[PDB]
Symmetry: D2
Subunit: 334 residues, 4 copies
C-alpha cells in the first residue's frame, strides 16, 4: 500500500479519501492530511456533504488524529508545504490539492519536505508528465518526480478523443464544456482577477477559459494542435459535460460512433470510460466514478464527416478516483 498525504482537504481532497473508503481498495493508504483549520472542522466537513451526502462510516477524532476505519490519520495545519513533516511520517506520495501550488516548482516543495513523489490535482506548469489515467498512464517512468493528474475536463475528453480517433479519425475539433460552478467563484458579484469569474455563480451562464482541448493534444500526441475549446459555467453544484464537434477523416454514422465507444467501454477502458443508452440528465451522474460517460442518444452526424458528441463527468467523484489510480501506479515505480 502506497503512503499518501493529502494537501488541501477540499472538494477534491475530501473526496479522494471518501472514494478510497467507499471502494475497499487496499492498494493505497492515506497517512496524513493538511489544511488550514481545526482538526474538528475538517472532520465535520468530511461527515456532512451537500453534494454527496453523509459519510458512510463513523469519523473519529483524537487530538490531532482522524480515524475513518483503518487507523488514525495525522492532521495538520501548515501554510508552507515545505515545512510539512513528510519525512517523519514517511510519505510516499504528496497529493497536492490546494489550488495554489500548481506550478512544478511549487508542487516540488513536497519533495523538499520529505515526500518521494508529488501529484498535482490540476494542470501543472512544468510538469514532468501530465496524466489521464487509462489513456497514457503507461508513459510514467522512474524519471518523473512531479507530475499532473490533468483537469477534470481533460480526463473526460481524452478517452473519447482517443477511441474515436483510433476508429474513424479526427481532422479538427472544437469543444465547449458546460461545467458546474466551483469554489473559485463567488456567491455574489465581487472583486476577482478574472472578470467572468467575478460574477454571481448560481445566477448566470458564465463563459470561461480552459486549456483542456490543447492539453489533450499532449496526452495524445497524435492529436497535437487539432482541438481547441472553452467552457461555460452554469448554476449546478456538481457534474459537467463535454460537447465536442469535430471533422472525421472518413465518412461515418451515428451507429459506428456509438459502437466504438461501447466496445472501448466494455473492454480496454472499463471503469474509466462508460456510456449510457438512456435519456439521462446531469444529476443522474452524481457520484459516478467514471472519468467520462458517453451519452449515446446525443450523437449527431451531419453529412458524413461532421460529428457531435456529448460526454458527462462527475468533476468531483471521477477525478478524485483517478487521483488514487494514478498514485498507486506512480508508487509502483518508486
Amino acid at each position: 500500500a502506497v503512503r499518501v498525504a493529502i494537501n488541501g482537504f477540499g472538494r477534491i481532497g475530501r473526496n479522494i479519501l471518501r472514494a478510497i473508503v467507499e471502494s475497499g481498495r487496499t492498494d493505497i493508504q492515506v497517512v496524513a492530511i493538511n489544511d488550514l483549520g481545526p482538526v474538528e472542522t475538517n472532520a465535520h466537513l468530511l461527515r456532512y456533504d451537500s453534494v454527496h451526502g453523509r459519510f458512510p462510516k463513523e469519523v473519529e477524532v483524537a487530538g490531532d488524529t482522524i480515524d475513518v476505519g483503518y487507523g488514525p490519520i495525522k492532521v495538520h495545519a501548515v501554510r508552507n508545504p515545505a515545512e510539512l513533516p513528510w519525512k517523519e511520517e514517511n510519505v510516499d506520495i504528496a497529493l497536492e490539492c490546494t489550488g495554489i501550488f500548481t506550478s512544478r516548482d511549487k508542487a516540488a516543495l513536497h519533495l523538499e519536505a520529505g515526500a518521494k513523489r508529488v501529484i498535482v490535482s490540476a494542470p501543472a506548469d512544468g510538469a514532468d508528465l501530465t496524466v489521464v489515467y487509462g489513456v497514457n498512464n503507461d508513459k510514467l517512468t522512474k524519471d518523473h518526480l512531479v507530475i499532473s493528474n490533468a483537469s477534470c475536463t481533460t480526463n473526460c475528453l481524452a478517452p473519447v478523443a482517443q477511441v474515436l480517433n483510433d476508429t474513424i479519425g479526427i481532422e479538427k475539433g472544437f469543444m465547449t464544456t458546460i461545467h458546474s460552478y466551483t469554489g473559485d467563484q463567488p456567491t455574489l458579484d465581487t472583486m476577482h482577477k478574472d472578470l467572468y469569474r467575478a460574477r454571481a455563480a448560481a445566477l448566470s451562464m458564465i463563459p470561461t477559459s480552459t486549456g483542456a482541448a490543447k492539453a489533450v493534444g499532449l496526452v495524445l500526441p497524435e492529436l497535437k494542435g487539432k482541438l481547441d475549446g472553452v467552457a461555460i459555467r452554469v448554476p449546478t453544484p456538481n457534474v459537467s459535460v463535454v460537447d465536442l464537434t469535430f471533422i472525421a477523416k472518413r465518412e461515418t454514422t451515428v451507429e459506428e460512433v456509438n459502437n466504438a465507444i461501447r466496445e472501448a467501454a466494455n473492454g480496454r477502458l472499463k471503469g474509466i470510460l462508460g456510456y449510457t443508452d438512456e435519456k439521462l440528465v446531469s444529476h443522474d451522474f452524481n457520484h459516478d466514478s467514471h472519468s467520462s460517460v458517453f451519452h449515446t442518444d446525443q450523437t449527431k452526424v451531419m453529412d458524413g464527416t461532421m460529428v457531435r458528441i456529448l460526454s458527462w463527468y462527475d468533476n468531483e467523484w471521477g477525478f478524485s478516483s483517478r487521483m488514487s489510480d494514478t498514485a498507486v501506479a506512480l508508487g509502483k515505480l518508486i
Copy 2:
C-alpha cells in the same frame, strides 16, 4: 394608423409582448384584447409582478373585464376555444397566438373563423403560409400570407448571424448547441411527461433537449437549407439563452474578420436586431435586452483557418416579444 392586435394566451410571452410595446413607447401597434383562462385580476396581478423582469413600470388599472395600462381599456377574455372569440366586433386586425397549444396552422386558423384578419404564431407553426425572422426575411411578406409564424427564440438568434457570416465569408456546414433557460413546459420536481428528458426537475440539472431551430434557418434563408443542425441543453436559469455554433467556412478567415463583419451589420443593416458586445459579459447582463441576437466577440474562435466557433446571446422572452410586434406592424401594412 396603428395595427389592432389581440394577444391569445397571457403567458411569459403574451405578457411581455404587451409590456414591450409599453416600455418601447411605440405608436405603430395597439393591444385591444387579451384572452386566457382565469379571472381578470389574476392576469393583472401577473402583469404587475414579474419574477424575472421586475415590477411593471406603470400602474395597471382593472375595471370589470377590462385592463388599463395607460391608454384606455383592454378587453379581457377567458374563452378556451379560439373559434369563439369576438374578434370581428372588437375589430382585430391580427391575432397573436401565444398559448403553445394552437401552433398547428389550422388551429391557429380558428382566429380567422372568430374574426381576426390575420394570425401570427409565437412559435414554429406547422404549415404556416410563411415563417419570419424580422430583419432577415420580412421582405418576403405579401398580401396573401394570412397565418404566419414568428419562428422560435433560438431561430431569431441564429439566422441573423448565419446570414451575415454566410454573405461575408460563406457557411458550408455547422452544428448548434443552444444552452437555454428553463421554461414553463418543464416541471419543478421529476414527474410524468411525454418527453423523458423534460420530465426531470428543471432547476436541478443540465437537461439535453430537442430543437429544430437550426434546420429552420432553412425556412428563412433557403440559401442555407440543409446546412445546419442543432440541439439544446436546458440549465438552471429562468431567462436568457445562448447560441453556441461551430461551422465550416467556405474560405479561410480569421477571428477579426468574423467579429468585424458582425459589427458592420450590427451597426448598419441590422441595427436593433443583431448587436454585439466587446466586453466580458455573462448571461444576466442580457436580461431585458430587446435584440434578437447579441454576438460575443471575445468568444469567437478559429481553428485551421476554416473551423469557426461563435457565441451569441438572446433574451428569449424579451427579444422575441419585441419582434412579435415588429412582425405584426409589417404584416399590418399589407392588410
Copy 3:
C-alpha cells in the same frame, strides 16, 4: 403475512413509498399493484432516476404491463375511476390513495367498492374515519376504521414535538412557521394559478403560503385543540423542510430541559419517528432521512423562562413515505 398494497397515482409520493419499502428491507408490507394513466416505461424510468433521491439501487425490470423490483411482477394498471379497479381480483388489503385528486372520504372510498378492504389517503382527507400520525395516535385505530388519512408531512413533523413538550412542560399557545421546500404543485416560472402566491416562479423567491398543519395537530392530540396556529414560506430548495415553532410554556423551563425531554422521547417511545441532532447541521443533511421529525437541539431558545422556540427538520418526502407503510402495517393487523 405481509399486508398487500396497491398504490394509486405513481407520482412522487407513490414512487417514494415503494422505494422506501425496498431500501429498508422491510418484510411486513408488499406492493402488489399500481394504477396510473401514463405509460409503463415512463413510470419505470422515473423510479430508476430521481433528481432529489438519486439512483434507485435495484434493478427495475419492465415486462409488458408489469414491473419487478426484485420480488415478482407488479401489475400496472390505468383506470380512470377508482371504483372500477380490479382490487378484488387482486387481493388488495389496503389501497394507498396518492393521486391528490381523490382526497375526501367519499372519493377515496370508491376503492372499497373496487374490492379493497381499507383505504389510506396520502394527505388530509375530509371526513376520514380517523387521521393518523404514526407514533402519536397510532393506537386509536380500530377494526371499524375503513378510510383514513395519514395526515401531512408538516403535521407528522410537528405533532411528535408538540406531544413530548406538552407532556413534559405543557403548551399554552403556539405559532408554527414551516419553511418548506418547493413542491410539484408550484410552477417553474410565473403563470396562471388559483392561488396567487403559488403562481410565482418556484425557485426564484421566498413564497408565503397557507398550511393546515397546526389545526390538524389539535385533532391528533385533542388536548391541544385551539392551541396552535401556523403558515408556511416556500423557498428555493427541492426537498427537506423545517418547523420553526415559538410557544408559551405552562411553566418555567430551560434550554437543557426542553432538549433533554426530546432526547428521552427519541431514544425510547418515539424511536425512529422523532430523532434529534446535537450537531450544527443544515437542511441537506436531512435529505433521505426516514424520520418524521428531527429535533435540532442547538436551535432551542428560551426567553424569560416561558417563551420557547424550537427547530425540527423533516424530509417531506421520505419520512412521510415511510410512515405510509408503518400506518398501513398497523391497519392491516386490524383487518
Copy 4:
C-alpha cells in the same frame, strides 16, 4: 453643503450606495473617493453590470485613476490599510466603512487617523459611539459621535415595526427568525470556514445562523431592551430577506388593529422607511425597493388576543444602502 464621502470597500453595499445616489438624483451627498483591492477598471466593470440589480443606468467612464458617473471624476484607490488613505488631502467628511473587515471602533477609527472627520460603519460595530436605524433614532445623533454604526439590514427592518406596535399596543416579549438571502461571506460549495453552518454550500440548503439583530433593537429602542431574541435561516436566494416575528402584546389586539397601526405609520411619519403591501407578493417583488421594511399585511395573525405574528420584507442590499446616505447626510450637518 454636500457631505463629502468616501466608500471604503466597493462591494455589494459599497457599489449600491453609489448607485442609489445616482438613481435618486439626490444632491445632498457626494461620493468623492472609492477604495477597494483591485484595478480601477475592475471596480468600474462590477458597477456597470450587476447580476441582481441589472445594468447601471448611466455611462461609467474611466480616465486614469478616476471614474465618473455623471457628475465629475471620483478618485479611485487600492489601499489595504485604512490608516494610509489620503482622507485629509481629499477633504473627506465621512468615511463609509463597508469592507466587512473593520467593524470594531478601533479598526473603524483608523479612518479618522487618515483624515476623515466621521466614520459610519456599514454593520454592527463593537464600541460604536451610537448605533442608528434611520427613521427611528437618528434624532439622537450629536456633534459628539465620531464613529457610528448604521446597524444591520435586519435591525433596520425590525426596529420600525417594533416601534409602531410597541407604541400602539405594547410588546412584552418577542422572538424573531429572519429568513435571509445568502451573502458574500458564504461559499459556493462546502469549505473551511470559522463557522460550521456558514461553511456549507450557499445555494443548496436552508442554513440556520446567528444574528444579534433582535437584541440590537433593544438599543435603538431602550424601552425594548432585553425583550426580543432571534436567529436567522439563510436560504438559496441572492437578495431580499424577511422578518418573521412572534410576540406577546400587552393587551388584547386584533389582526386589523395591528395592520392599520402599520399603514398609518407607513403613510405618515415613517413614509419612505416603513411601507406595506395588501397584496399577495413574494420575495422578488421587493428587489430594488428602497424601504427599510415593507410589512406584509395578509400575513398578520393573532392567537387568543395576545399572541401576535407578523412578516416584513427587506431588500438587504438596496434599502440599507439608501439609509447609509440618509444617515451620512444627517451626520454631516452635525460636523
